From a paper:
Noroviruses are highly contagious, infecting both humans and animals. The human norovirus capsid protruding (P) domain binds histo-blood group antigen (HBGA) co-factors for infection, and a recently discovered bat norovirus (GX) was also found to interact with HBGAs. In this study, we determined the P domain structures of four human noroviruses and one bat norovirus using X-ray crystallography to examine structural features linked to potential interspecies transmission. The principal structural difference was a variable length P2 subdomain loop (Loop A), which was located near the HBGA pocket.
Author numbering:
A (entry chain A), B (entry chain A): 223 to 295, 311 to 542
The structure:
């Protein structure tokens, strides 16, 4: 009677990143990527329990929303936001959720626009959200500021506004595998999705990869990838099906879309991430799909990739 | 043995528009909206056959892509593109597809950015795509131009570039329910998704609604909605399941998410759109989900909304 667990029958090439609105360009396993992952977006259990700051669908990944504050709690001045969820429902600060759902889970100067909502006249202008700064990016406290030199005259106390990202600036310190300090100078622990980590020596996380759009001054080049543990279409699939997990870990096979050949197998863990048996950096082109084959015991040994 | 037809068990409030990257804010039936719909995005049959320019997932809705042409086939100069699909595979012009998949299917000055791809150094800058212009927007011919005053020095012949939209300018003539002229001055008919139209007097199309972001000079106000026939998550669901249709038309019920009460019923047509029995403008808040109940004969009479 219980809903069987399944994966979406879609090639990875047709999926999108769960941490930024981008297509998946492939997968990577690498001993020089972080051995454990702590992302807060793209986190769901296999039986459909959202974790961290993860949205169920791609409504507003990377966005923050709220109402304009005329006072704090080229020259770029802060635009302060009394934060809401991106669907404009209330966000309770200092509670059991690190930030509103969909809030960026990386540290960067994020470029984008600030959108005045239709009730106050649809308009938008350029702004950035610098998630490296404790003073203006502490969303766990219920407030955050974007920065803009284009806001003059367009906002008044209480206006609904939403930040929509286009990309980042990237420098020598950019590392998108580090979480921001959601509480600013104040530590936060409650409601974080836990570390995803293999428990088999010889297994590594299989990450899904996208290219992050970058706009540095004068076009300075520092190309940057962004990883996630689950493409958003897998998050939505597990959320929608709510299939009970019926074993320690899910055995999955990656199937070539053209030939139907089994390319490799992996473990899909209940906490929502993939591991494979590998020792060296391996790049997987996304012209295949994952197929759930069976629930297996935690001591199952994967065929080496 | 055949896959049963189903709808995604998600409230409409968690779905996104199939014609622009936006959340669905509700549904509308209205005798003063077009009685037939001709959108090319968000078109799929119930058994999973994509139509028009419709992508299976939200990879690149509203984008166009290609390689830079240094020659034609503030002051804003055209940036000419030898068009590809947005996944960088080849687009065959003058054939059986009106434009690359995901190409905008409305006429507007679409604001956004132009993205130089990582192989030539990740960088992006502001640009617009004016889909009202025959001379620079004829994607059926394999070429189109965006316009920019920020490109100087950043592009060379053959560079991969992608236009990503943020919103539109809107004026007194804006009407997003009219298709662009995909062939420019040359008519195009081949490969268009057909008109969606009720076949019951007393029934009207149930449209899904989003608010389009607008940026007019000086913040001039002209708020604009954009309609679609299917949210993209329904498109993806039907595409993924490939469920055979087992009757003339699908009977669906809209269920209140809180109470589980049946709010109204409608017909979900094989060509991929909803109709309901109504006479006057009716606005539906999206805090419910559609449930497939049975295949019915084409002469089935719906309970009035
Ligand atoms: Cl499966
Ligand atoms: Cl259903």
């Amino acid at each position: 009677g219980s809903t069987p667990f399944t994966l979406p029958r879609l090639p990875i090439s047709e999926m999108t990143n769960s941490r930024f609105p981008l297509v998946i360009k492939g997968m990577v396993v690498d001993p020089n990527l972080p051995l454990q992952a702590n992302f807060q977006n793209g986190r769901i259990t296999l039986d459909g329990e959202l974790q961290g700051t993860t949205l169920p669908t791609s409504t507003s990944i990377g966005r923050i929303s709220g109402t304009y504050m005329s006072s704090t709690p080229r020259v770029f001045n802060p635009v302060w936001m009394d934060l809401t969820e991106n669907n404009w429902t209330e966000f309770q600060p200092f509670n059991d959720q690190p930030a509103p759902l969909g809030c960026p889970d990386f540290k960067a100067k994020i470029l984008g626009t600030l959108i005045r909502q239709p009730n106050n006249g649809s308009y938008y202008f350029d702004a950035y959200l610098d998630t490296r700064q404790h003073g203006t990016f502490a969303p766990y406290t219920g407030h955050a500021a974007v920065h803009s030199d284009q806001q003059a005259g367009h906002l008044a106390q209480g206006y609904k506004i939403q930040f929509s990202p286009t990309g980042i600036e990237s420098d020598q310190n950019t590392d998108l595998n580090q979480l921001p300090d959601y509480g600013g100078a104040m530590t936060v622990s409650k409601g974080l999705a836990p570390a995803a980590a293999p428990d088999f020596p010889g297994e590594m996380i299989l990450y899904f990869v996208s290219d992050m759009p970058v706009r540095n001054p004068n076009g300075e080049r520092r190309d940057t990838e962004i990883l996630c543990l689950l493409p958003q279409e897998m998050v939505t699939h597990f959320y929608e099906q709510q299939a009970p997990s019926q074993g320690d870990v899910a055995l999955v096979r990656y199937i070539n879309a053209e030939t139907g050949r089994v390319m490799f197998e992996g473990k899909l863990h209940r906490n929502g991430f993939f591991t494979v048996s590998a020792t060296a950096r391996t790049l997987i082109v996304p012209d295949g799909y994952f197929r759930f084959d069976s629930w297996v015991n935690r001591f199952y040994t994967l065929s080496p990739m």
